[PDB]
């Protein structure tokens, strides 16, 4: 596709196909002049037909095994696109068996290939978007939890809070680190890495702020109003960064 593929995985899978189609176009109908006979494609086309039914078999297993309602809705259209593109290639092989110089066959070869590239592309992006929603759910779960920081007023409730928040932050940090590495857009990787580091370094500051508050609200004298401000600031700065993470996780020029 004209745009860079979204992730390195999708890139390593489709880049070679996109390039080979360009070469085909340059060589054929939108290129030089190959009124030269194209060999029999019956075999290589049947192999595609088999690879297509395999992909669709795996894809359907995903649809009836996923909880993501969007994934269920968006994948079938891609099956149709790939299957329909395949039908043009089968037709191209037929025509070429009858006439190696068939012009319609050449246009079908190009359209069918583009169609399979496009359908496989949509299919992988739908999966990738489902994958990203999983990360956003973990991120929103931490947002929700930071929201209950207000409640903690006991030295033991603080140890309990920390007990949960610790792991959650670890899971999110790992998902973001692995996700950022898959991006093909550097500026997007940096934003995720910087936001994550900001949220990461603020975790101790938050815990330290809640402890100051608790030990404060368990010992007389007014140092309480203050303790309250820094805890709230932290919870806001962390939440803001996590929201920025959620935003960047969804950025795309498509692919």
């Amino acid at each position: 596709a004209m745009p860079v593929f979204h992730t390195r995985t999708i890139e390593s899978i489709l880049e070679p196909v996109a390039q080979q189609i360009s070469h085909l176009v340059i060589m054929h109908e939108e290129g030089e002049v190959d009124g030269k006979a194209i060999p029999d494609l019956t075999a290589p086309v049947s192999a595609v037909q088999a690879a297509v039914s395999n992909l669709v078999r795996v894809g359907k297993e995903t649809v009836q095994t996923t909880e993501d309602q969007i994934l269920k809705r968006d994948m079938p259209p891609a099956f149709i696109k790939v299957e329909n593109a395949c039908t043009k290639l089968v037709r191209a092989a037929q025509m070429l068996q009858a006439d190696p110089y068939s012009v319609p066959a050449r246009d079908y070869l190009i359209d069918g290939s583009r169609g399979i590239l496009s359908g496989t592309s949509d299919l992988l992006l739908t999966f990738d978007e489902a994958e990203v929603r999983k990360i956003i759910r973990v991120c929103k779960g931490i947002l929700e939890y930071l929201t209950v920081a207000e409640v903690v007023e006991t030295m033991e409730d603080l140890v309990t809070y920390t007990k949960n928040l610790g792991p959650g932050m670890t899971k999110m940090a790992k998902m973001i680190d692995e996700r950022q590495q898959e991006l093909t857009h550097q500026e997007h990787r940096v934003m995720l890495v910087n936001s994550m580091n900001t949220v990461k370094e603020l975790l101790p500051v938050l815990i330290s702020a809640m402890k100051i508050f608790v030990t404060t609200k368990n010992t007389k004298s007014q140092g309480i109003e203050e303790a309250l401000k820094n805890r709230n600031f932290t919870v806001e700065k962390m939440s803001a960064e996590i929201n920025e993470i959620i935003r960047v996780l969804q950025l795309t020029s498509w692919d």
Binding site: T9, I13, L14, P16, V17, Q20, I21, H23, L24, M27, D34, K36, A37, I38, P39, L41, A43, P44, V45, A47, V48, A50, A51, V52, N54, L55, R57, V58, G59, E61, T62, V82, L89, P100, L109, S113, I116, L117, T120, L123, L124, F127, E131
Partner: peptide
């Protein structure tokens, strides 16, 4: 979650092979 990715790589490979065979 990679069975879908492997199915896709397989199709990608098959199309690449087709385009290579189409070269006259």
């Amino acid at each position: 979650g990679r069975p879908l990715l492997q199915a896709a790589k397989g199709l990608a490979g098959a199309v690449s092979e087709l385009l290579r065979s189409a070269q006259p």
